[model samples]
Target: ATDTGGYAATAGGNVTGAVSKTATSMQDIVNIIDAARLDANGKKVKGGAYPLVITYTGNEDSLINAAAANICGQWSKDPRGVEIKEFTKGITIIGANGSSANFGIWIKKSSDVVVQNMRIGYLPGGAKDGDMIRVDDSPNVWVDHNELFAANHECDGTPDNDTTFESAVDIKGASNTVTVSYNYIHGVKKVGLDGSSSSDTGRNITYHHNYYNDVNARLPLQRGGLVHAYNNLYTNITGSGLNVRQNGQALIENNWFEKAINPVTSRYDGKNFGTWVLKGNNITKPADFSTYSITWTADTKPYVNADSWTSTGTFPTVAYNYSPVSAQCVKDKLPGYAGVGKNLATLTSTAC
Candidate 1:
């Protein structure tokens, strides 16, 4: 319990000969991380000479409902995962209570990783990087109480026509100091990615008590660095939430946005764009945007919205430690504590 309440302070695989493996499939978690790559005097330890806590008790939910009912034939067949490549010694993939996974957990160039209480679903090849949890070039990662989902529609002819399912938590290159807490992402449609292009930006992420529903756009999609969304509970967001492009810098706090649409933005870079700092959200100003039905569009390029709920810039003094539990107590207790089974519960501030 490294207290990941924000800026990734990992203790994943909780060090010192840490070993408690129990994988149950997905090739027993790729042969227990390839037999922990040596060391006990054997040598070769570029990121695995010990330190692991696997425990995935696989389920495969009927081959993820028969490849999510033939997702374009699992995108040309052959793309299921469990690759924690370049291990860096620490790990912790807990999933065990009813366990499930249709494959997806590619933490490349890893560091102290920790993916808890998983339920990762409907992941088939989605063209290639079928992400349900991808943290490439990882750092002190901590993606807690998971339950990522799929099917936000877009099947037609697939391939570039928008690869059906992919991305539930896609943090990109040089992933540094990450922390995505209590996730329960739903009906996905590209709900992830903090730099996978536009020069793959910097890092320092943290999304708290997540429980988004009917997703459509990247709750992420930030391109530069520093994102600190808090006590999340975005609902029915049909298209845009947190875009924050190129020069990314977000800090949307005390969250609870309902029937959202462009909940906070900085659209397709008409030029740098990117900058947020709205506080205690539940729709701040603009007359609480028609009583929280919040909506906006019309981006022929240079976009940057928040409908004048203010704070379009400034955010940097958030180094860790958190308490947030307001925006109506995160929309009335964040669905009984965010995701997966209530077992991994966490929503403090003294239970609001």
Candidate 2:
């Protein structure tokens, strides 16, 4: 009745999906999809795959996400949560209890899917990085209205904190038209919003109005390529504020950051990637003025006024910021401000 069920399901007689010969259980969901998939041998059956809908009456007798992630097999792995692979289309998972899984929700190799309105939390032994939801190489996905609580309650007599490697949501690698909105996250001691191109390209990403609280690190890192962010809030973060990893065209604006440990940051490592430069947003400090942003641009260095941001270190209202000019100045993106680029006040444009 309380917090139960992760990626692996608990066993019970009154289970909705049973273990049948051809996969009456949840693993059968994978099995059904795998059987219809074609192999490289140019053999295996193709097309005419039927859609199987498995509903959880109360809880399945043998669920895979709750079991060990390794049990999900080599094709899928969610150490703490649930993972569904094999290019399954239009798959939907509704929570029978609090959530289906816990550690990671790997939604990859699928298209035009919707996963929404679920809740997740709790971790054992303090780790560094984990996300409530992770979208790796998946496109046209919708993730909304989920609650993720990073374990802050001190593990009783435990040496390490549980849910240490926790992230609220993550989108990585060629994930276009992806949307994450209206979610709640707390206690996870790292970046609340996280995404990375890493090596490929990630474009057309968006996040808005997420309630973040008591985290240990910065916001998401934009490793490279095109990205857009707006209208989010960070409350009581115990670490760095905004962190952009490498390179990208950022449209980060209309967001809010309250008081915590570290706020307002830009890293400059200048790698040959796109960029993680975020500008245009407000931090309401309601008190002190502390602009704590680090610029690590090793490539061409895209952060313009990283050192010039301001924050008032107090409570509730500790910071305020305007969106980055680079975003608004784009001819197509922002139009009117297309001329905005790289400390225009410090540098001179010959054509102007």
Candidate 3:
């Protein structure tokens, strides 16, 4: 149902992204996303999975946008998020400099999924709120061992202004059960991991063991809700960095924060009563989070002081950054695995 002559069709019973679809015409930096729905196998599926592995067949010299808008315009409206029932969780998007169109990949859905071993690289200017692997409204999701950056959002004439802006990875909405781990989330156009919350129902999230460099800030929109961030390596964030706020719970544990300008800032609506948890974090230097907007390196990363914590906990060093962790290897049989664990492991809930 797009400008292209093709309509959404399932090739046989396969739900593969490699199938001929509207993505062939779009900017290519993006892929088209379809509404999430249950398939015959009782697996929660979204978009048609290609019959075979979709390889990077484009020009190797340039970054490609493989999907439409980098994401499908519609989804099941999974008010509850797309669920991958039979281990075929939400959706699994695999990308790299050669396969993906623009910034590697993007998505807009309420589905449980995981995007691993992918690369969200250099991109054109004016990148939007979409993510290298954006898991929106789809709780029980995960993004790891992947790389996201602003390779594309930079161009000629606009050296300093080149950041027109594109976030590396983001999780928005009340979709709880989220995690961002073991990822090389660096060289981001603007910042790295962004966690936001417009509602208070959000809960239980984790971001750990990620190598964060080049990306301006390690984490943005901290106060949006609750988060457990630890063991992240910060190398090139000049904005003074990471905030833990927005009237909720935040647990910062044994993380490696080196050479960060202002690595910690925490704030609350001020009316809430939950104490923020900030403990066990090992920063090369105390974070100097000063403000929210992009700023000079002198300002510290932002975060409220130790006044709002319910209690401080223990910090331990967990060296988890090597290659594919246990969570990344065994994926579901289906081609697309959204937030579902086996399918997309990170986002899929183990509830069943």
Candidate 4:
């Protein structure tokens, strides 16, 4: 967790109503979730922030059950050439023995969902782009302590990297007050999508203390959103990073960019161009700052005096607890605590 002030403090939704659901076997797990869901209305049969605490008994047979049943597969094919699962309740799906899954998880028109301490898509051969977690038209959500990875020809002798066409985490469609923290990602073509070009609205997302490893680009290609990114580690970015386009606005602070090409770019994407405010970011092998283009409209909300935002008392204090690694040592520290298979209970000093 990185400095969780600014827009993140107001995004925790209701954590008090969370309930517990335990499973000892894989078949039982799918049956429990299937029983919990209402596919018709896109709500839990219990409805309205139906908090769930999914606990597993650490059985290999359970993993087999999950793989065969595709327990998370309430999703159907959308026009975007991908399958999507929509949820609108306050839920938390955590693992005790590093629960793993193959499909993508999306929270749509919902609130207060916490998915942590689990592994996704790091299976033996790996899965495709749908191996992502999405936040769409949702408010007050947190995605933390998970892993998103795939195999590439250069790395694992698999298919091309572009095969994972979609990003690992996509924040779009007027998604408001969301926080993405403490995840490890690798072998991705693109990392994050801040907004959709077709729709002109998305807002208040914070990305902090996460590890983006061996990823190609789009540390987030933005459209219309207000993003607060801090203390994140970006290593092995093979392409242009941070393309803030369209009407998106970002506050990038205290992050580490190592071996990353074109770390910050506000260039026109032929559709729209956005703006960013930067401060105290440490970088290695950085490109010249002149390559960046600027297109700041009233909606882009450019922050001009970011040069001294931290020193001039303009930065807000973090109200919640979020442990972040130092910029100088991000490469060594971030990967240890991030990703899914690790023990979520003791991974962090603070509660997830």
Candidate 5:
């Protein structure tokens, strides 16, 4: 079960001597992680004293609905989140059915972390780092079967005129190996960042079987290293998708793209553009663009667009073991299996 079908192979807190705890609130999660930093004998452990699995039983659906209903009011409030820091012993945060949160989760300088089956939405403090899930300086992380969302439009007078809302799953820093699968992300402007900046690059990430709709950009903005993206459903993308920068390489295969703009390209930097090996996607040639409602636009800065619909560059062989369902199957059945309520189900070729 810990085989992520990607580069990240982690058991999370499902290890020997791991303790189980329940959290009913954000404060409880914070307290539990704090407590886990020490040994039973009261000695401080550098990473963590022991592995821990925290079952979050909180239900913030009412608050989530209220905030979503009045998104402007939610944006005016300060941000709230839970940070799992330096817990190398491994940790898994699983949400019970019907559980939800108005906050986010940030993992820093840790490894072997898993976050699943959580509905996190309408987070505040977009001017700050309010990403629904941010993986920073961590390796061996799996983020799966979660629903992350926010408003797709930006409020006026926000800082830089672009920080009204933050990303859904922003992975940056030294987080080397990550797998983001079976997630339903919608109504967000910035989707994710593979690297925080131009110089901050290097990581192996895989994104598979995720459903994305009404999202604006950053699916994701890769800076470097390698990315394997397959069996994903992308629709109603108002802005560009997959802005690969810093010479990053992405293997994009067997994905469905509908009503999306610039579904794969390298933009902004103009120079040092990245590349993608396109195969098995719904769009195969230039004519397929119109067939699938895929569009392209010119960026102010110089950019590379996948107009030819051919392999723009080469990529290393994928290291993980996976058999992606057909693009049509992903488009047809992904909604049933890609979010929090499906009990962490996965799409298989057989089912296709």
Candidate 6:
């Protein structure tokens, strides 16, 4: 079931001289991502060609460090290099930003970047290392409608000891191609991830209409390549949701699990290898393990299948400017309009 992902073009980073930059603080957003500095209207910061439309007016307690590892990891191959918004659209990135010994937003090897409607976490008691947004071997990146909590991870709500946060969005190297859409994840425990082991083969990713509340496991935990989970909307997931191993090649569609518990899984304990294709989902509970024998060629190039699976893809023309929701009204319009300032339609993920 498609709605997006399988990218040929869904462009993000905003392309073409993308002007307008107003980042009140955080070292002026680190001098608009220092490409040799000098901006603020002085000019001279062109790496992959112009792209910075940041706008984070400031003060959620005002304080910045951004975990500097060379200022959050190489990301400015200007395909619209940066696009954090809020110039009246819904300002978020929580306060003057953060860091607790590093690793808050680190994209490596750059590409057409993006990190929408901000609200990333840390700073109540602060101290969060590891993922909050860590992409490696990046490609046409686009992590939309932000609200990625989980920095000070907490969740004893019942899921029994959740304190996780090593991946709020961790896409690894291996020809990585990322796309995590319509966001809003809570007290995370690996909301989305790709290529972690088995040498991390050429990975490609996508997860649509997101809204996983207080999750416990990798609502996304693929270990190999091409994954394109669609129409997402899980509530109170305690553990065990879409997770694959070795040559992981998934296509889980039309999702919507409530009080989840193993919405779909593969490779357990001694995880070795696997493959998938669960279609037209809406589970209440149904998942088994140990299906060893990697295999996948399920056509439809990358993903674009909304009216419920079986291929023939088509829908994914989101040329980035921010706020274009529609993934089929994403479970009653994605828990009150995606994230931040609320009010951006185009939301569809066909749970219609």
Against the true structure, what is each candidate's TM-score?
Answer: 0.34, 0.56, 0.56, 0.69, 0.98, 0.30
Q: Please report the TM-score between candidate 5 and the true structure.
A: 0.98
What count of clashes does model 1 give? Answer: 2
Native-structure RMSD, model 4: 8.2
Off by over 4 Å in 6: 1-10, 18-50, 53-83, 87-131, 134-141, 144-167, 170-178, 181-188, 192-205, 208-227, 230-238, 243-288, 291-352
In the range 1-352, model 4's lDDT, one tens digit per residue, is 3223334442232355555787554455566556556544666564433445666554343433543344122122221211223444555666565555544565666665666765555232223435367777776677877777653223333345343235678887757777787788876766777776646566777787788878877778766666678778877777656776665677677787666655666554554555666666663222322222211222134322221222222323433555544565554466676766666422232332
> lDDT, candidate 3, residue 251?
56
Worst 10 residues of 3 by lDDT: 1-10
- Number of the top-ranking candidate, with lDDT as the measure: 5
Worst 10 residues of 4 by lDDT: 74-83
**What C-alpha lDDT does candidate 1 achieve relative to the native structure?**
0.86
User: What are the lDDT scores of the predictions, listed in order?
Assistant: 0.86, 0.44, 0.42, 0.57, 0.92, 0.51
What would the per-residue lDDT of candidate 5 be over residues 179-286, giving only the tens digit for each residue? 999999999999999999998999999999999999999999999999999999999999998888999999999999999999999999989999899989988889
Per-candidate RMSD, Å: 17.1, 14.7, 12.2, 8.2, 1.0, 18.0
Once fitted onto the true fold, the runs of candidate 5 whose alpha carbons sit more than 4 angstroms away are: none
Superposed by TM-score, candidate 2 places the C-alpha of residue 232 at a distance from the truth, in angstroms, of 1.3
Considering lDDT, which of the candidate structures 2 and 5 is the better prediction for this target? 5
Clash count for each candidate, listed in order shown: 2, 71, 82, 0, 0, 19
Q: Candidate 6: minimum summed lDDT over ten consecutive residues — where?
A: 72-81
What ordering of candidates by lDDT runs from best to worst?
Answer: 5, 1, 4, 6, 2, 3
Q: How far is candidate 1 from the true structure (C-alpha RMSD, Å)?
A: 17.1
